[PDB]
Amino acid sequence: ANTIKVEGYPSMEWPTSLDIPLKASEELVGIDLETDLPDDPTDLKTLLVEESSEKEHWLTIALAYCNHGKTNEGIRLIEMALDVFQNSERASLHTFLTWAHLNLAKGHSLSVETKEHELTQAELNLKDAIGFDPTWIGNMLATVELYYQRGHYDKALETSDLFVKSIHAEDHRSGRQSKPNCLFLLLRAKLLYQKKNYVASLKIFQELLVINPVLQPDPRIGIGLCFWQLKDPKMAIKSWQRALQINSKNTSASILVLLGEFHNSLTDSTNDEVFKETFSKALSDLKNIFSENQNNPVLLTLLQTYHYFKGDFQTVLDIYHHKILKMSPLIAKTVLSESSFWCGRAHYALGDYRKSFIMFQESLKKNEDNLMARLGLGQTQIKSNLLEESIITFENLYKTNESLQELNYILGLLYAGKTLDVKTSKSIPAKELNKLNEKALQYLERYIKLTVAKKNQLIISRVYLVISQLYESQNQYKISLDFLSKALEEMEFVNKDEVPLEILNNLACYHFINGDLTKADNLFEQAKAKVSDMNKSVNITLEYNIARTSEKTNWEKSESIYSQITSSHPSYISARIRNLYIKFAHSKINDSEMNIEINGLLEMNKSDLEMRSFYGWYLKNSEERKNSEKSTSHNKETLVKYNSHDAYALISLANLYVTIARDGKKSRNPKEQEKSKHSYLKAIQLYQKVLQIDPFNVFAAQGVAIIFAESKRLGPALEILRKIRDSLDNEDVQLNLAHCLLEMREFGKAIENYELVLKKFDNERTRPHILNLLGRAWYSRGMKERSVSFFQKALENAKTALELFVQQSAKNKFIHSVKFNIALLQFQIAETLRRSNPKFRTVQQIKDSLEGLEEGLALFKELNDLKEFNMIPKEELEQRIQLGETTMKSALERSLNEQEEFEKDQ
Amino acid sequence: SDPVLAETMKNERVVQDHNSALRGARPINFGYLIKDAELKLVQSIKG
Amino acid sequence: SLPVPQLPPKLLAYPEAPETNPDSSQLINSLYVKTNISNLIQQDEDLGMPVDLMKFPGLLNKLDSKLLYGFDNVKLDKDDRILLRDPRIDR
Amino acid sequence: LKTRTKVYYQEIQKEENAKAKEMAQQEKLQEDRETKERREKELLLAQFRRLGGLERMIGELDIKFDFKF
């Protein structure tokens, strides 16, 4: 039953029968000690005193009583034997009683007082037996074991070492060989295990296995224990399973095999079905084993675990407070520590953080290496608004858990929360805040790596969100978008149905600043698909986002969404600012309704910097609005010192105050030239400050730029313009490139960038005026007299600019000089063809030139008759009239029907 | 006033300021131009 | 020159996700999966190995301590011999 | 110290160490078929190995005890 039984191995089973001799000398009175043992041992006492039987029969019957659960009966029997066997024959009786009371002190469902009483009686009978036979092995073994049962492990080890020394010495003196005593080896093994010497313990336990493979207590238990502590759980479980298989009644082995079942279900299962199967089997075995060991603290702690995960927190507390707490002094510190830990988890789940703190502390007090409990204490400190204390707890844990993934996650999130708090940014220098940021990134990135290493574990995708948020704070949006997309790809994998609309929207926002507006609109609208439940304030933002991607393809929907948004809610400035730009881009309006509604907008939130930048753009764009003299005061008041150290309106003021200085330099009076020598250095006295505040501001760079095309230092300048092209696709910067270019410059590089302005865009005011004025390229090109086809290219330029400006007669009061430009190159095709050689291709060519010449005469007439014309002196009007017209009337006919004769000659 | 606009007021963050999108798309540092200026500045305008 | 005042689409903040907060007990649970019952394998201070001198016939009754010294020449089964190997030898 | 049992223990220990070391070294080849990928993804997606999953999977277990504490 309760002994190890293995085929081929030895046995340690007691004899099952016993004869007693009689003085009548009939050699038998058989007692089957499995059956014929009376429930009252006095009934046998009468037989044993009747026959004057030998002591060993008393002891044999008492041991059969003990090896049947009736230890009290055997005790009373030897206690009755003690009233009979006087003197030295008492020794063995005291030895038996010492071991019987040790056995009783090893019993379940004991009290502190019962256990102490049994140990005291053990020590008393051992004192007596030592008084008789101080050298018997039973008494020495009882000495060591009593020392062990009272927690005096060092003393027990030293005593047993001295006993073993004594035995080897006595054997060596008389020639006997010393065989290893299994019980001394087993005690030394358990003691070394208590001293955390797992290698030595394991060796002794394995050699015990060899010496006596059926030894009870099974050394395979100790073997498994050492394997486990040495981080070999598979071999540990194999050992415990073997112990159970060779003695199915070994309860310790059954509990250990049960723990192994829980462990293997948690760590070996590859899917939820296998997990639920194996875990259900473990819970079933737990129920079966518990039904017969209801005072077992390991089983009760397993129940605390199951009822925690089952949500039944009240039962966790009940198990702790009604079962474990009462037997507290009688259970091992590590088991009690785990039980307290689960009770603290229960309090934590109920929101009772004071009690959870107390419980995790009590858990650590009985096992300070309880890692779970220390993490629970850290988290309780978090919940208790003790953030710095929690960080200290976690970093102290980190000292010896550098590779724990959950710890890296927790420390990373705590440092990330610190880095992103505004209060900390207001109280520590920037360098310290940046080092805090990188420490957060270190923790989070090492968590990522540790989880990626075990390539079978799933990353908590919030880590990617947090890393994205950390990089967003320091204005590195490439890596930010990268980590946000990595977050969503991990997040759609796990429950694709419910990913937060926030991640889709914010990826769309990051794509808007990149350039892909169709994908931005796409994901913006997959996010409008999944908007929230109550007070859906997310629609206002989502609709504005879609309405702001819809501005340059299908701005009718910009119209619609902006209008309904501003009609529904009034304070949204960012809506109708852009709406009053969709206004401008399509001019479905009276300028007066504009100034009315904005100059209502102005003062409702005066200190909003954005609408200030909109009324700066209000008075400086395509049609008219010439003065804005008060705009000096406008954009100096936008700053005006309330919120100084800001760039936009500042560089607007810059641009105006540098525009003043060109008109300053146009004058012949030295006083205003010296005055423009102030409107020019105000530029570099403020542009320096705004490049100091933000170097990468592109437009300060064009500030400097427009100085050099104006101050004749262009060589250095078109360098900067070639760079700001890399960092801008504004038509202004690149037509200024071709501005600074056109001067002191062959042609190829000019027409290049002026057809790049051509095709970059389709705008309708810049285009006509600018390429009007810079057909000039082919014009001066032709002042070098290249060829005739480029003359007619300049004709193309002129021609289209003319038809544009005359048909665009909404604002066309600037161009009579242009008219003369075209008339002038009619004149200049001829004047080039006047010095010529007959051997040119002639048919159908310069006919058109003389036609254009007469057209230019007709054009000259109109400007002759006008009085507002102050381009050339009126005397010189009539004088270019007479000179160029007495030459053409006596020269162009000359050339024409001179070349007709060469057409005859060809 | 109306608090339906209030939730929106506190849940939306500024992707790029008005003073911070004045920088193009692949920004280049122009910190060389401070000293370039105060050299060419002073070498040019002496009255 | 100058551009139009830009008000790009607005980023939203994320809703609170307590299950991934640092105070989330789910982190403790994920650790429990890996290190579960480890602190229970030692059941009591006897290490689940009670020394009982009443398992050795002849010892307490006849004062024959022979069985304390084991047996000679036992050949162990396969299932018992593999338990003799050194720990963590699977590298 | 050359008892039969110390020599026997040490011989078996050497043999079992050799065998276990060699098996550990060959663990990669034995059954890393195409199936390594099947099992890795099956493991990844076990709900019990992800946040909140242990409780979910344990919650789905019919079994429970007649606690009378």
Residue numbers in the entry:
A (entry chain C): 2 to 907
B (entry chain A): 163 to 209
C (entry chain P): 16 to 106
D (entry chain R): 502 to 570
Question: Please, what does the article write about this entry?
Answer:
The polymerase-associated factor 1 complex (PAF1C) is one of the most important transcription elongation factors that positively regulates genome-wide gene expression. In simple eukaryotes such as budding yeast, PAF1C contains five subunits: Paf1, Ctr9, Cdc73, Leo1 and Rtf1. PAF1C can regulate transcription through direct association with the polymerase or by impacting the chromatin structure epigenetically. The largest component, Ctr9, forms the backbone and shapes the overall architecture of the complex, while the other components join the complex mainly through associations with Ctr9.
We found that PAF1C from the yeast Saccharomyces eubayanus, which showed 86% sequence identity from that of budding yeast, could be purified and produce better crystals. We then optimized the crystals of the complex of Ctr9-Paf1-Cdc73-Rtf1 from Saccharomyces eubayanus and solved the structure at the resolution of 2.7 Å. The overall architecture of the Ctr9-Paf1-Cdc73-Rtf1 quaternary complex from Saccharomyces eubayanus was shown to be similar as to those from the thermophilic fungus and from humans. The major body of Ctr9 folds into 21 tetratricopeptide repeats (TPRs) that wrap around the N-terminus of Paf1 to form a three-circled right-handed solenoid structure, with the Paf1 N-terminus just filling in the central tunnel of the Ctr9 solenoid. To facilitate crystallization, the C-terminal long α helix was truncated. Paf1 residues 9–105 can be traced in the Ctr9-Paf1-Cdc73-Rtf1 quaternary complex. Cdc73 joins PAF1C mainly through its middle region, which contains two helices connected by loops, and contacts Ctr9 spanning a region containing the lower part of the middle turn and the upper part of the C-terminal turn. The overall structure of Rtf1 (residues 502 to 570) in the quaternary complex has the shape of a twisted letter “U” that contains three α helices connected by loops. In our study, we observed that helix α1 of Rtf1 actually interacts with a new surface made of Ctr9 and Paf1. With this additional binding surface, the total contact surfaces between Rtf1 and the PAF1C core subunits from Saccharomyces eubayanus reached to 3025 Å2, which is much larger than the corresponding contact surfaces from Saccharomyces cerevisiae or Komagataella phaffii, which are 1754 Å2 or 1509 Å2, respectively.
